[PDB]
Amino acid sequence: KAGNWLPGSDAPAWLPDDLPGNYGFDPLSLGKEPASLKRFTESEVIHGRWAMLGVAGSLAVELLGYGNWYDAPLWAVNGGKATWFGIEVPFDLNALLAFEFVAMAAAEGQRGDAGGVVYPGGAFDPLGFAKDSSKSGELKLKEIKNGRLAMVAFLGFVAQHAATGKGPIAALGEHLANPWGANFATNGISVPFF
Amino acid sequence: KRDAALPSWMPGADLPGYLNGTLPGDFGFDPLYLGQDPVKLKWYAQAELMNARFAMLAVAGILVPELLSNIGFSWPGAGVAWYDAGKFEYFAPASSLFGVQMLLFAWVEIRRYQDFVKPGSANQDPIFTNNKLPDGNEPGYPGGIFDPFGWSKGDIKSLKLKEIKNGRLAMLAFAGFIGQAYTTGTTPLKNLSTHLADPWSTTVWQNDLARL
Amino acid sequence: DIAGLTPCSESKAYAKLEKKELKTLEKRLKQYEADSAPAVALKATMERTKARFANYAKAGLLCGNDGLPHLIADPGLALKYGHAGEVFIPTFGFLYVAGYIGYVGRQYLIAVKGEAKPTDKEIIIDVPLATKLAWQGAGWPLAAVQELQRGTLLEKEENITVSPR
Amino acid sequence: RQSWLPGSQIPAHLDTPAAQALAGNFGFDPLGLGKDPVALRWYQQAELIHCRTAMAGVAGILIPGLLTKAGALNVPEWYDAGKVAIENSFAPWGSLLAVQLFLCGFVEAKRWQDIRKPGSQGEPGSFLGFEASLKGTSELGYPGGPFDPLGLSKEADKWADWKLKEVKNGRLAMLAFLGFVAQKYATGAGPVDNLAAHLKDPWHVNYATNGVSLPFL
Ligand code: CHL
Numbered sequence: 001k002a003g004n005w006l007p008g009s010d011a012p013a014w015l016p017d018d019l020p021g022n023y024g025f026d027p028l029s030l031g032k033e034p035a036s037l038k039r040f041t042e043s044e045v046i047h048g049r050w051a052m053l054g055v056a057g058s059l060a061v062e063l064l065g066y067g068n069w070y071d072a073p074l075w076a077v078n079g080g081k082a083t084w085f086g087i088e089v090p091f092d093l094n095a096l097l098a099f100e101f102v103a104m105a106a107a108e109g110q111r112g113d114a115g116g117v118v119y120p121g122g123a124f125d126p127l128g129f130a131k132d133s134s135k136s137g138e139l140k141l142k143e144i145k146n147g148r149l150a151m152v153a154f155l156g157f158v159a160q161h162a163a164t165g166k167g168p169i170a171a172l173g174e175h176l177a178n179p180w181g182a183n184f185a186t187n188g189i190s191v192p193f194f
Numbered sequence: 195k196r197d198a199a200l201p202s203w204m205p206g207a208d209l210p211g212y213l214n215g216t217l218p219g220d221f222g223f224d225p226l227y228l229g230q231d232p233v234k235l236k237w238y239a240q241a242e243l244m245n246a247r248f249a250m251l252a253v254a255g256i257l258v259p260e261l262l263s264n265i266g267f268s269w270p271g272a273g274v275a276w277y278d279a280g281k282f283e284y285f286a287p288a289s290s291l292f293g294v295q296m297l298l299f300a301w302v303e304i305r306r307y308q309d310f311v312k313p314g315s316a317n318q319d320p321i322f323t324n325n326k327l328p329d330g331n332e333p334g335y336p337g338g339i340f341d342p343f344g345w346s347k348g349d350i351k352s353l354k355l356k357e358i359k360n361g362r363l364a365m366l367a368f369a370g371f372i373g374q375a376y377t378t379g380t381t382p383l384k385n386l387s388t389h390l391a392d393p394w395s396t397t398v399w400q401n402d403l404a405r406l
Numbered sequence: 407d408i409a410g411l412t413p414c415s416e417s418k419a420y421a422k423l424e425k426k427e428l429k430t431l432e433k434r435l436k437q438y439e440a441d442s443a444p445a446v447a448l449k450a451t452m453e454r455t456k457a458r459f460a461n462y463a464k465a466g467l468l469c470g471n472d473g474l475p476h477l478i479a480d481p482g483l484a485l486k487y488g489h490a491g492e493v494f495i496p497t498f499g500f501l502y503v504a505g506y507i508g509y510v511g512r513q514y515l516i517a518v519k520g521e522a523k524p525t526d527k528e529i530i531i532d533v534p535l536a537t538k539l540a541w542q543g544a545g546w547p548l549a550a551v552q553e554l555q556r557g558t559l560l561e562k563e564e565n566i567t568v569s570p571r
Numbered sequence: 572r573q574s575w576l577p578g579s580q581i582p583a584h585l586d587t588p589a590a591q592a593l594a595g596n597f598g599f600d601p602l603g604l605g606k607d608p609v610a611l612r613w614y615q616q617a618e619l620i621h622c623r624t625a626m627a628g629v630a631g632i633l634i635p636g637l638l639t640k641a642g643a644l645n646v647p648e649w650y651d652a653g654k655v656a657i658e659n660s661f662a663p664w665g666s667l668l669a670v671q672l673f674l675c676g677f678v679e680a681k682r683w684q685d686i687r688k689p690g691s692q693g694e695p696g697s698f699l700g701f702e703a704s705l706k707g708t709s710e711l712g713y714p715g716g717p718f719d720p721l722g723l724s725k726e727a728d729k730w731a732d733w734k735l736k737e738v739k740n741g742r743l744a745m746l747a748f749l750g751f752v753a754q755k756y757a758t759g760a761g762p763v764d765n766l767a768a769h770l771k772d773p774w775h776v777n778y779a780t781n782g783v784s785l786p787f788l
Pocket residue numbers: 193194276277278279280281288291292295643
């Protein structure tokens with residue numbers, strides 16, 4: 001067991017001890033049925049991995065000064081040419097959707113027929129970090145915790161943007177400038193009154 | 195069924211059995227039988243402490259600041275009515291302070307609730323595991339670091355009775371501030387001065403009849 | 407408007423009709439005294455006549471070339487143009503009362519079939535029972551539907567007598 | 572044995588142990604709508620949905636109404652809010668309602684099939700692994716599970732008390748809404764404004780003098 005989400009509380013019985021990232025957090029008992037838990041265990045990792053790439057991509061765009069994650073796809077609706085690191089890309093919206101759909105369908109289709117493999121290894125582990133059984137146990141915990149943090153972080157980007165209408169890095173600088181003047185309470189939406 | 199040896203709010207009156215003197219300040223006062231159900235009375239016992247303890251702080255925080263101002267002690271917040279402190283301008287906006295307030299209170303209150311749900315389960319420091327509260331503490335009375343001076347090691351029963359008596363009086367006082375402030379329109383200590391100036395002609399009967 | 411009709415409030419023939427009826431009443435009035443009993447009665451009639459023609463125009467009815475109100479029965483045309491009060495709403499008003507009367511009578515008839523002598527309970531009404539069933543009939547549509555779904559509304563084909571065939 | 576009318580004869584169908592297990596049973600059924608046990612089971616669900624919907628709706632008319640008067644909000648009258656909202660809206664009311672019927676219809680349909688076959692929505696594979704938590708509890712109309720995040724229904728001692736509070740506030744809320752509708756036509760003002768008028772002069776501002784309710788007088 002990784003830890004305890006609510007100190008002084010009991011751990012659910014249906015959650016195995018050796019399941020990575022197990023803090024005994026299941027207030028709604030959504031994973032009580034073994035069949036449901038198996039699907040959700042895979043989905044959490046898949047969501048985490050996508051979020052980690054998503055958060056990194058969102059921060060990289062703004063740190064390098066090419067815009068923010070929100071307004072990257074505006075050129076399609078506004079009318080313009082795509083860019084990546086500042087170099088023009090010839091494709092257009094129709095071309096991107098077709099290629100993305102085909103590529104994702106083929107790659108995701110292969111995973112779908114696997115049956116729920118979360119840690120394939122081999123071709124996906126060229127450096128063989130998780131080859132050793134003992135070492136893999138702790139790496140899986142590290143992966144999910146960073147993944148869970150990334151999932152929350154991305155939710156922060158979307159929620160914060162809706163309230164403040166600014167990118168993540170822009171908001172962070174604003175908070176540092178005036179910590180007591182710029183925050184969720186002072187954006188005029190998060191707290192109904194004041 | 196309540197024994198006649200215990201203090202009674204109304205001497206010579208029959209009183210509920212479930213008020214058997216276990217709780218502090220148990221004078222058998224429950225004309226509406228609110229606390230009849232033991233489960234509910236278990237909750238009401240903690241609610242009285244929480245409402246009482248905040249009331250004692252609130253009343254102290256409404257009289258002392260005004261008392262100092264009259265004595266002449268000067269500080270930037272001097273001369274501000276207890277119901278005008280919200281409008282006063284501080285280093286940070288009221289909204290930002292409110293947001294911090296709830297985040298801080300959310301941690302401590304849930305910590306307090308966890309003990310109430312399962313006593314003794316929230317007596318350990320999450321970070322520095324060496325720290326810990328005494329294992330004998332009961333809900334509503336943490337002790338340990340919350341009792342640095344060890345007063346709880348003396349006549350605890352008397353101290354509990356003294357706390358609830360001062361607390362109950364404090365709760366009534368705060369209701370007086372709202373009623374008096376809403377009616378008189380002035381600060382509490384101003385009302386006391388008016389009453390002392392002419393106690394006989396300054397009763398609430400005099401004051402309210404004049405208004406209507 | 408609908409079917410070539412026009413609102414009675416805008417109908418020339420409708421307005422002329424009111425004058426004809428009032429003129430007839432006025433002609434009879436002038437053969438009496440100012441405040442005699444016949445005169446008061448005639449004046450009361452004229453007030454109701456004026457009120458009636460104002461109410462029908464205010465109700466937004468449709469008048470034909472005859473200058474008389476015509477009613478719209480199609481539910482679609484009624485709800486489309488706000489004529490629901492002519493036929494559509496009164497349709498469900500009548501059925502509630504008609505089902506009320508029929509349902510109450512059926513309940514009473516079933517109640518006395520259990521008695522020793524049902525025939526004597528029909529010529530001589532059991533008033534205490536009838537009043538009890540009269541009040542409970544207000545919820546007949548709910549009770550009627552629940553009987554239908556539970557299958558106790560209809561008799562079995564094998565328990566009903568029929569002629570040779 | 573509490574009853575809506577002391578000294579009256581409680582209907583027999585409401586005195587059965589199954590009937591007395593229902594929250595808020597005060598023997599009130601003069602029209603005999605619950606005589607059939609199968610019907611009473613259906614009408615109990617109707618009351619719960621009416622109760623809960625009415626409470627949410629009334630809270631959405633009353634709490635905004637008081638805060639609007641207190642100056643903390645600016646919300647139009649409940650009978651005008653529909654027109655005000657649709658103006659500064661991303662969709663017309665036709666499109667907004669059509670979506671509402673799909674989402675409500677889908678959710679309502681699942682609830683409907685649980686009344687016909689209790690616990691039938693936990694059919695393995697029917698949902699994307701989420702069917703396990705859609706089985707409901709042993710009491711119809713009290714789903715629990717994901718609908719009870721704080722787990723207040725897991726305390727057996729407080730269970731009967733909680734259900735009684737819901738039905739009592741639910742019945743009161745249902746009457747409140749009927750009062751909002753009747754008071755809008757009768758007085759032509761808001762609910763909170765009607766309360767303010769009554770409190771000013773209770774003995775002259777009431778339904779007995781509104782000129783509508785008692786036409787004969
Ligand atoms: C024990 C709890 C508690 C109580 C009983 C009060 C009671 C009061 N507060 Mg206070 N507050 C409390 C907690 C808190 N307050 C505030 C922040 C404020 C502010 C910022 C203000 C008050 C004011 C008021 C008064 C409201 C009546 C009035 O004059 O309205 C009429 C209101 C006005 C004339 C103010 C108009 C301008 C204002 C900027 C508009 C926005 C006001 C907010 C909606 C207030 C929200 C308060 C809520 C959170 C308790 C009243 C004396 C008001 C006051 O002092 O008025 C003289 C006021 O402006 N309170 C915070 C955040 C740290 C609290 C946190 O717990």
